[PDB]
Amino acid sequence: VKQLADAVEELASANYHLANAVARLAKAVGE
Amino acid sequence: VKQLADAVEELASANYHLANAVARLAKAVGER
Amino acid sequence: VKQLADAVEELASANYHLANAVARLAKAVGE
Amino acid sequence: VKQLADAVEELASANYHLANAVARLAKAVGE
């Protein structure tokens, strides 16, 4: 399952990137 | 399996952060 | 398998929170 | 094993709830 774990880690990193972007959009909308 | 559990925990943390960010966006949209 | 189950339960909780946030966004857009 | 199956079932429930909310957001955006 090591390669699946690696893939899940990649997804976690992508979703952190997405959260950061969504937060920036919230800020832009609210300002 | 511990590596997989660790990875899933990391994804959970990421998704909590995404939920918070989407909630901020809902607030921003609703308050306009 | 216990620790994996516990991690999956945290992911389920996170995705429930995500669902609730998207539901709030749907309400805000719809109104 | 039971704890893991229960956890996966809870993740399925969360993701289904998320799907519903996303579908409602799509409707809100589209109208």
Next chain:
Amino acid sequence: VKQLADAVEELASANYHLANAVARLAKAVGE
């Protein structure tokens, strides 16, 4: 093992529902 296979099937079904919902959102945003 049955409990887990059943749970995995529920997750697959939820994720298909989620994919369908996101596709509808993409169409809405794209329109």
Next chain:
Amino acid sequence: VKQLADAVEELASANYHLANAVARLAKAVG
């Protein structure tokens, strides 16, 4: 796990389409 993997693949496709729609919107707003 074929069914589960296929569902995840469909979600990936959907998010690709969502991303492209959002990028087009960003260009329109700009």
Next chain:
Amino acid sequence: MKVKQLADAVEELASANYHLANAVARLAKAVG
């Protein structure tokens, strides 16, 4: 259990979500 199918699918989802993140960041810049 062919774990490869699932790992490949999760990698594809990660790739899509990085692309989505970039698109959302571009929308944030355009709005602001």
